[model samples]
Structure formats: structure tokens, C-alpha cells
Target chain A: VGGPMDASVEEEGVRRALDFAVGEYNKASNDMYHSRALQVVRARKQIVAGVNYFLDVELGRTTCTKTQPNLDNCPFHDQPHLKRKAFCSFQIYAVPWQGTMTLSKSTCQDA
Target chain B: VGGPMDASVEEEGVRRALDFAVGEYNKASNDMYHSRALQVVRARKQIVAGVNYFLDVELGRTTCTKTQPNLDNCPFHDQPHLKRKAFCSFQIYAVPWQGTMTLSKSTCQDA
Candidate 1:
């Protein structure tokens, strides 16, 4: 006979497994809530903070011809340079879980 | 001696150079203004658009253990799967000129 101890241990294992699952789910849900709240805060900051600093500066008012008498010497006249430098830098704002996840039960079952 | 046409042509060249400089500067200024306006519009859209949709779904309330009786069968119990899928997707919001550009006048002059 495997004995009562074995039966009790098996039952405990099942109970623990269920508890862990529930705990994980709750944790994930909590994580999601906090992440969303953080994102909201960040989004607000971005709006109130104003446009990307680089875009603002780059796209800001360029000096007029009268103001910049030397065309060849001026940066504006450098077409190739301007084009090369136009997209020299960019900022990427990434939100987590913005993509999909595929789960295969078969793989877990095998494990 | 060279013909008078040479002198007149040379003077015209100077006038053309000045005109081109003025024109180019004006064009750059106008472009800057329009670019700035467009950025504002795009920024407003992003802010109004709201948070990333993925975070919303992933972080929503998860059913309790009682709701999910089968721990092993449940997807939530699959820790490895969840970790792999947690960061499966992301959205990057980028703004132009958010980075730096370096210009070397010597390079332009040589070109």
C-alpha cells in the first residue's frame, strides 16, 4: 500500500498547484493594471511636455536669406548635408504587450 | 582683351548667386514652419488616440482560481509560456529629430 501519507501529499500537491496558478493570474492582472496606469501618466507627460525636442528644434523657423547672406556657407544651402542629417535621430515610445503571444498547450503537457 | 559680354556675364552670375541664396533660405524657413505645424497635428492625434491596446487586454482582471478549476489545463498556470508571451509585442512611437546630427563644414566644402 502506498499509505495515507502518499494520498495526503498528493492532495496537497494539487492544492498547491491550484494556489500557484491563481496567484500567477492575479499577479499578471495586477502587473497589467499598474503598467496601464504608468502608461497613462507617461502619455500625459508627453503631451504636456510638448513635442519631441529634436523635431521642435529641427522644424523650428529657419533663418531667412536676408538674415543669412552667405548661401554656400549657410547650412540651409547644403542639400546633401540636410538630407543626411534630416533623419539622423529618432525616438521610439514602446508600450508593453502591444503585440501577440501564442501558447501551445501541447508543449506544456509534454513538459 | 576679353569681350564686354564676359564682364556683364560675371556680374549676372553674382546677382544670380544672391538671388539663389535668398530663395533657398526662404524655402527652408517655409519648410520649417510647415513641418512644425504637421508635428503638432500628429502629436495631438497620438495623445487623443489613447494608450496601447495590448496593455489594456493583457492587464485586465483575471478569473479567480475558483473560476479556473483545472490548474494544469489552464493557460495561466503555464509560467514559461506567460513569460515568453509577456513581451511578445510592443509599439514604438518615434519622432523625427529626437536624436542628434553632426555636420562638418569641411566635408561640405570638399564636396
Candidate 2:
């Protein structure tokens, strides 16, 4: 009976979901450099078994490589030529009561 | 020789460009309800003869109809069943010095 509700990137749950999804993206990517979500273009949540977050996020290549241990300090590329962007849509399902989140869908296009 | 640089929705030029694109979208759309841009998912600008803004934006249906006079006061539909959303990629070219803006390309999908 419920549909999608507008959400924010600053929300604790949504940020965690973004982190999980981006981490998964890094794990599956072949690029040497890691990509980070620049911002949420659109985010919505719908109730299902738990909650599913649908997000449209912009991504940029970061200064850190895949071999880096942590991404906390990584920043997006500053040089013009290195300024590559990608647009991605992600569906992340979270079982908040269980403290579990999983990336359900991910699709991206180079921009 | 130059590539795209990250842009912000708060920028005066980018906000104007979004207005131009959304207005054009409503003009071309057949939906009874007008649509509004929720936020920019991704935005970038490239310097050409003028400036080209490439944006990824989330859109939501508004309570106003296509026959509405102005969109300034329109608000997005809040009801769950009526809350329709769309994701769009837009390219808007602006000759700021000339005081001109044009929607170059638009592609969207219902979400």
C-alpha cells in the first residue's frame, strides 16, 4: 500500500547504504582507482520486507587506488583530464532490525 | 581540450539551466500533472564556445496540471500512490554573456 518516499544522502541509513554499495562497486570494478559517490542525485525508499533504497548517485574517480586500505581520506581527481564521472542507479535493501544491508541492484553509465 | 568539471545546484547558472530544462520538459510532456526537478543527481560543466551543462536530475510529479499558469508555487505530490518519479539526463547550453540558455538534450525514464 506504500510507495517510494523521498530520502536524503545525509540520513544515517542512506549514507551507510551508499557506503555498502560503493564498496561493492569497488570490489567488482576493474579500474585501478576507486570511485566515490559525489552526491545523491535522487534517493527514495520503499517499504517491502524491510526497506529498499533506490538511489541515483554521481560518481567520480578518487585519488586512492584499489590497493588502498581505507577510503576515508580519498578525494576525487582534481585534474581536468582526470575528471571522469559516472552516473549510477542503485537498489540497496536493508534489514535495519538485523543491522544488515545488501546491494540489490547496480547499473552505471560513463559520463 | 577541456573536460567536464563538477557543478553544484546552488550555482546561479546551473539553477537557471535546470529551470530552462524542466520548463521545456513540461512543455513537451503529455502528462496531466506538471513535473519538477527534486534535486541534481549529477551536474558538470564544460567550456565550449559557450558553456555546456550536463546534469542528471530526479523529477517528481506536482499537484499542478499542465494548464497551470506558473510553476513557481507548485509542490510535488506527497501522497504515496501519486508520488511518481523520473530520472533524467539533460544537456543545457548557455551563452551567459549573451543572456541565452537552451536545452540541448533530454532523456528520461520513469522510476
Candidate 3:
């Protein structure tokens, strides 16, 4: 065998080896033939990508009048006991190849 | 000559006649002549128009974060002991002949 890969490679290799082993076993034995297995891996990757994009794109784009809630796509307007003083604001900038946008809010006293 | 004229005409004529009399007195005697007199009339008219325009335009244009301070250009941020929870928001629209815009704020529990 290949004698002792690099430390980083070892970590990744073990993970990949495990995944391949599980995938092959499912493909050989299960009626779904690893379709579900591949789907699961793909779904996880998609979720990670979605979260990364949200952090990259939407983080400071929307400024909360108060603290930011920790969940994604949560209804800001419907939070229990969340008193929002300011209305949200958004701005969009257009460029040739890339574009950016932002959203923010201010505080209000008596709504 | 015209009997008593129409009732509306009579009322208008009386008011105009009184104004003319006042103008003549101010013109004849005052050292500054009627300049100051006319200025007063003009100033009063301007004040009325300004107040009217503010009520007509700015009232709905800017949503008060709290209660409006009842003073011109009062700072919304410096109200005594007032707390604002939400930030203000605004939208502007453009048109060929005329355009309209709106400003609004939400209520917040804490500023």
C-alpha cells in the first residue's frame, strides 16, 4: 500500500475511504443502489453551500434594528415579543459582472 | 346704484373697502409709508402658505419615529426621555411630470 500519506491527507483519506466503502456496500446490497446515498451526500453539500452563501451575501446586507436571530428564513416580523422600532431598508448596486445589495433598519420609539 | 348687490358681493365689497381704507391711512401718514404695511400682509400670506404646504407634503412624507414634536425641524433623536425601537424607512418614486415619496418607521420595544 501507499506508506502513510501526509497528516492532512490521512484525515481526508480516511473520511473518503469510509464514504466509498459505505457507498459500495449500499450499491451492492440495497435496492436503491446507492441513489439515496449519493443523494444524501449531495444534499449535505448543498446545505453547506447554502449556509456559506447566506453568510457571504446576506449577513450585513440586512441590518436588524435589534439583534440578529440565529435561524435562517425566520420570520422577523412575527418573533414573539420582538419589538421592532425601525423599518428595514435595502439598497442594490449593479455592476458589469457582479452586483451587491444591502438591507438595514432604524429604531423607532412608539410605533 | 346696485340696490344692495348680491349678498356674497356685499360681504366681499365690505372686506375690500375696509382693507382699502387701512391701506390709505398707512400710505398717507406713516413715515415708512405703506411698505411695512404691505410687507406685513405679504409676510402673513407667506406664513399661511408655508404652514399649508408642510401639512400637505411633509406630514405624510416622513413617518415620525415617535410623536411629532410639534415644532419645525425638531430632532427626532433628541426627544426628552423618548425611546425608539425601530428605525425609519423611506421610499422614493420618480415620474415624468411629478413624483411622490414616503417615509415610515416601525415601533421597537427598546431603542
Candidate 4:
């Protein structure tokens, strides 16, 4: 589909992003490669980019407190709109296969 | 609250994350610091931890095709679940006001 697709906040994002990218490319240009009949689905490989993907899935949340747990910080506390976020980053396992089905729209028109 | 929150895939995510994080922290411990009577709210300032935020907001989607636009790559292409994703990362302008409302729980308890 043609809208925002979301996953968790980790490797899943990258995995999905790559899959989506390759998937998109395949859609408009698969005809020239193997044949117009052999539709392809892609899998992700290594990130050729310099930290190109940012993705995530909602892991879960816990009720944590701030270092300055005060009425001021807690102004909106005890409600749906109250919370703090601490983030840490980790590396995703490398992608094994970056697929390649190079073709072009102009070239495809000839087919 | 106690579940998953979703925003688009951009700075919005970071903004909401920080807001959510601070909001959560404020909820449970606001009483100890300021008398728990005055709930708090926070805003973000700087990304202290070497690019510590990954966030986004769903913008919109467009129907695109692969470089090799064909029926093959389009295997599932003509469907909702068909598409590719190209990723490019950019720098966040920067956090301006990472809030500073430092306090403690037990310290709040003493309050």
C-alpha cells in the first residue's frame, strides 16, 4: 500500500524499510529483468548506507520516575499525557543479501 | 499511558518520545518532589547522548515502481502490500531545551 508503515524501534525498522524499498523498485520494473510474469519479492542485506534506516516497534512501557520527581516535572503527572523517555542505541545484525535487479523505465518501454 | 504510541517516522517521534518519557516520569513521583499535588510536564532541549533520539510522523505514501518496472518484480506489486523503501537519513536541527527538573523519589518521599 501507499501509506506509512510502522514497526518497532529497532532492527525491525531497518528490515522493514529495506524490504519496502526493494519491494517498491520491483513493482514498477520487474518486467524487464526475468520476465513480466515472474514477480519478485525481496529480502534485506547489508546497509550500504551510513546509518540510513530508522525504524522501530513499540516494545512496551513502564511507569518510571524522573531524577527530579517533583510537582513541577509531574505537572501533568498521573494522566495519559505524562511520561519521560530515555533512549539507547544498539547495532543491527548485518544484512546478508542486498538484491540486484537493475533495469530502467526508459529501457522497459522498449520491451 | 501503559501501551504503544505511534507517530510518523521523523523528529516527531523523538519529540513525542521525550514528551512521553518526561510525562511518565512525572506521573508516579510528582507527589514526592512538589507534594504530588502539582503534576508536571516537560519539553525537550538538546540531544545530550550522541544522537539519542529516533522518531517520526507518518507523512503520506505514493505509488511508485521499481527501476525495472515489470510484471515480475510486481509479483505482489499490484496489491496493497507491494512497494519498495529507499532510506536516507538527515540531521535533526537540534534540541533546544532539554528540560532540567532533577529530583528524586525517596527524596520526594521525604517531601
lDDT (Cα atoms) of all candidates against the true structure:
0.24, 0.51, 0.22, 0.27
Question: Residue A97 CA error for candidate 3 (Å)?
Answer: 17
Q: What is the C-alpha lDDT profile of model 2 across A1-111, one tens digit per residue?
A: 344566666765555444444444435545343334433586554433444444455555555544454443456666887655656654444444555555555565767
The true-structure Cα RMSD of candidate 4 reads: 22.6
The model with the greatest TM-score is 2
lDDT of 4 at A9: 37
Docking class of 2: incorrect
Of the pair 1 and 2, which is ahead by lDDT? 2
DockQ of each: 0.03, 0.03, 0.01, 0.03
Q: If scored against the real structure, what TM-score would every candidate get?
A: 0.14, 0.28, 0.14, 0.15
Candidate 2: what lDDT?
A: 0.51
- Please, what are the lDDT tens digits per residue for candidate 1 over residues A46-111? 111121111111222223334344433343232443322121112212222232111111100100
Shares of reference contacts reproduced by the candidates, in order, are 0.04, 0.05, 0.00, 0.01
Residue B8's lDDT within candidate 4 is: 43
Show the lowest summed lDDT stretch of 10 residues, model 3 chain A.
Answer: A43-52
**Per-candidate RMSD, Å:** 26.0, 23.7, 35.3, 22.6
State the DockQ, from 0 to 1, for candidate 2: 0.03
- Tens digit per residue, CA lDDT, model 4, B1-111: 322233343455343443343333335443333222111122222212111112231211234233434423334333454332323221121122432211111000100
